[PDB]
Amino acid sequence: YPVGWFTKLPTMATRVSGNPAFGQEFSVGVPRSGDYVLNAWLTLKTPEIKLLETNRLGANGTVRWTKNLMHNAVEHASLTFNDICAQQFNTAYLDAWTQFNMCEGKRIGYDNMIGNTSDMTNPTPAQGQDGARTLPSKNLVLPLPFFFSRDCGLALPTVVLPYNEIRINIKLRSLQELLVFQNKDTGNVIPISATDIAGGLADTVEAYVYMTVGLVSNVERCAMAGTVRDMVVEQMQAAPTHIVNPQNTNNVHVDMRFSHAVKALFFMVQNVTYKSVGSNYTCVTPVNGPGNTVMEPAMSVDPIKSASLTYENTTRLANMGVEYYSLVQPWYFSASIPVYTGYHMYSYALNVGSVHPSGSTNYGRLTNASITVTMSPESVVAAAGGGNNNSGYNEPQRFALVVIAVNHNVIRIMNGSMGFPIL
Amino acid sequence: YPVGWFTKLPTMATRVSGNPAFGQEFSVGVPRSGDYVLNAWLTLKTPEIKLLETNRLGANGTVRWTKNLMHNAVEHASLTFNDICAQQFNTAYLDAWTQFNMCEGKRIGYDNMIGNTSDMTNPTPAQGQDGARTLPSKNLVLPLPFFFSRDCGLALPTVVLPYNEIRINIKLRSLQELLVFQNKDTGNVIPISATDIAGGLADTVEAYVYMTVGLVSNVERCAMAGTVRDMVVEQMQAAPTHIVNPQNTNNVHVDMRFSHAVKALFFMVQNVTYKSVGSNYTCVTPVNGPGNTVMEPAMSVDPIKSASLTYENTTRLANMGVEYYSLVQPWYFSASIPVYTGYHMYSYALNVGSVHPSGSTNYGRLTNASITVTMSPESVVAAAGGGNNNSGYNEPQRFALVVIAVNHNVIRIMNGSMGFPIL
Amino acid sequence: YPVGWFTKLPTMATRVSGNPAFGQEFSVGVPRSGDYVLNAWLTLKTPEIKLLETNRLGANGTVRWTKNLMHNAVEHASLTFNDICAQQFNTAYLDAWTQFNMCEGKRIGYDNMIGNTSDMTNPTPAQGQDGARTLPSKNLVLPLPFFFSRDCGLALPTVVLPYNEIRINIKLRSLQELLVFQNKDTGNVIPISATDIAGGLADTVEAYVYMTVGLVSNVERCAMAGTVRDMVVEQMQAAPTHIVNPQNTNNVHVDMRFSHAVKALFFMVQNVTYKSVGSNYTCVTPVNGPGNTVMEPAMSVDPIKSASLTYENTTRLANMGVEYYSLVQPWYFSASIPVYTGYHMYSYALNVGSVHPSGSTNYGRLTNASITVTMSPESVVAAAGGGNNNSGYNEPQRFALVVIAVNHNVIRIMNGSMGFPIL
User: Which InterPro entries does the UniProt record give (chains A, B, C) (predicted)?
Assistant: First the structure.
């Protein structure tokens, strides 16, 4: 004999603060008078202003060098809780979670709700992201994955502690693709000019944020706000570093430090403008003018040679190529597929979210942890292609080595006491 | 030390009643002398009688306007239990369950066992379903999803109550694609005539129904038929309505009423003949003669503008387009990619089949619930295309608004007592 | 208040024995001084030695008849435990597990890490597996699925019994595709000759085996090696037979016997060289010279007509075609799409790995079990194609009927006692 009551679950639009534009700080004030919060969603519309298709028009920019806009607009998304930075997001973490957790039908639908694919569409995160024609009326949706947006039993209640000031920050990007850019560096300097309609009539972006509010019956509402609840969360930790400039020799050895136990380590080398490009550009059709394809696949063409993780000043894995650390590593656990760009990961634990860590890199006693990245030299032009031994001018553009990790924490919920227990 | 015994699980062919033809009532008598029942499969062979490929032959009909046959033959499948209509199916529910529960590799294989794709095949429920050549010898399989065909622990036993008269009904359709139709309305009136071999040599359909029989060892057979078992089921509820005719203005406000708590609401606007067509037809090659592609994708081309669900005479969600209610809504709970036709869905609950409803629309106390559908006006010919603002003559063909919902019920099993508990 | 300790999980490279070459026995000695072992991985590099693309060059062999190398190199992988053959693998089981358990993103990534796909790539196990150009520098990875490589709670501990001698055997194959073969039988007899660079500069294969070692804290290490533990495993059982030669009539009735309860039966008819080819070859472009496509899809073109499983000298399922036993059967339990080659499967149980068999073919009391395979006659040349009624010379090449089954066993762990309990 089950017990059922009149339950509800509305989706009221949360308040916004600040004018959403290009390159500005946008704060979102999620409500706190409800029982428990769930997953959030973001809405950003970025229409193009092109005209012709993928045909070559000399030095004019058409629909051939287009990338995802909403995926590049985000830069940092920190979830502040009780005036304490619990977890923070970046541009590399938004693409790393798709190639790890999203294994079922979530990855297929992610390519259509992020990348503007109309003319010659392709359900892929990269390699062919051409837009529409003139003024495409559409909307883009990008959710924010959290540690309580996966199950109803692991949700964070807001009625038990209505005094905490929670707030998320969304940092937008001023540089937009297919609007003020067309090449790898600068395209004839087009800030707002309309050279044969290819950079004019630029419009701003609109941010429509909404957060659902949980509604529990009054029978279980009094018992929830008064009883001690020991919850388990999975926060994120990032540490942006710097990689050596591509030249004759490429070898780094920057140390990596964190806090408690870390499940796994993952990072991705990205560019400053076309961060979703793996292989080097080529001045041979059809690669760059006309650009029917952004870049060729095959991880062997990527300038990144190999890598090696350091642990306790001892070896951790055999010196394998990029085809094993980027493909086979996410294929073991969770069974997900990546993309030809420059991802790196290492399979470790097999249970994410439990009451006992069964194999986790406890960094509380470790005092030696670094990472190395081997790249390919240049000594070649950017009109012949790339590879594992030669790279054109599309290599010095990427120089940001941001490593994002995931740790496990326990939030102590107590009326009148706020402490930090064990990991 | 586990306990094992000699277990069996055969699949005996059940009996049939009635001659399977075109447009007739076909009853299936599932056995009841066994211990329990699982899933049932249906077999219907619908061979074509065409000759040429997708080449244009003037007014003659070839292989260019073909749709799925077994998916259109099913019209109503009601599962009668104890002379009480527990749940009923329709033509819209067979396509809505594919874009919801089928998230893994179930949707990819569903396109091959339903849609006849031979010449220029495409693993998709629509957009390119061309058949073979002359007399294709093949068979089609379409099972019936029930509330006890998902796990062995939630199966409905038949040995505990061998007095209930269970029977399922299969209503076939007389109108078959690529046999008596070729255009949107009537194609030169071809009832049985063979105009250059394009509608002759029509054959009937054969129905091969078989239901597996559960076999439980005698150690647990006596304890099952005698002990009270409180099982939880997930029935279905449908309510066919009527939408306004496409004209200058398109706005409806038909109320929707049900019974107990409903998990989520979903419906789909379908045509009378080519119900698997979303975008409007165009008289420009290659759309209609020759028809290499049935219709263009992009949800913006669909005549349906937007919708809004009513709850407690208050707003429920922001007025979003069709790209958000058809793509992002099924992307949350159970990420399953849909299709470009005209499906609507709203994410709500996150646990289907539990002992406690954690967020369900309890309709037992609600007295106000409606739905609205906004379409696009005409004022344009059917030879230029469709869109969100103009539609040709392919809009008045669809006028059936059948909404299918899912509710939760508890079947009280008692020897000598048959009552209805709570939801 | 959870309990956490400093845990580790290294991946030390295990020792190797024997020189890895073409057609030799390679033994792998996994360590046993650790706490528990997990999943293992294999590394085999098989570079091609071609030059031109898929262009026709007369009788010369180019890149048009290429198949997977690492999938064909393995032949028998037996996991010996305590000098007892617990389970054994074959070439058919490595492809059957992909079309069964691998339902999510595991099958998509399996096609890229097995089949050499560079020029005109295709994420599919067959139908288009062309290599690169000259000397492709790449590595292939193929793990070994076991009964303890699916979850951390069901892992086999090695610290509780450090006296058992565990060892796995890897039998390599001397016949390699795109090296000493180009046609169906013999291609102008090319053992090592380099006819216009198409079979010269042959290199050996390197085997890099590594097995991770489990590390548990000392608090739970003493309690694990001393207390009894009743674990449940899922072993494999194979039985290679022989099918009748393709002629005027094709009908077999070889009995099948095993041990305890079997979950399900599955087999696949494979060739001796191009075992990943289902449809018959055709001398019409583009099938064989130039070979842009290996074979056409559609299960109706396969020479295998139908089959029927025998159980207790009684019928078990209706005489359905190959489109029902190869597609609809894997579509039910664990929705995994197969491939067009000749795979057979029958859905039975729904729970794999539990404490109570809820429906298993207990062969302990059965004394009658056989299988039949119906094929198509010849009486046609190999230059017109295949089908369900006619087959060319590509039918007598396949004559190995190896049936692989899966059973359930219970390993009794006791210090000083080694017995066999029930199934």
Answer: Capsid_N, MCP_C, MCP_C_sf, VP_dsDNA_II
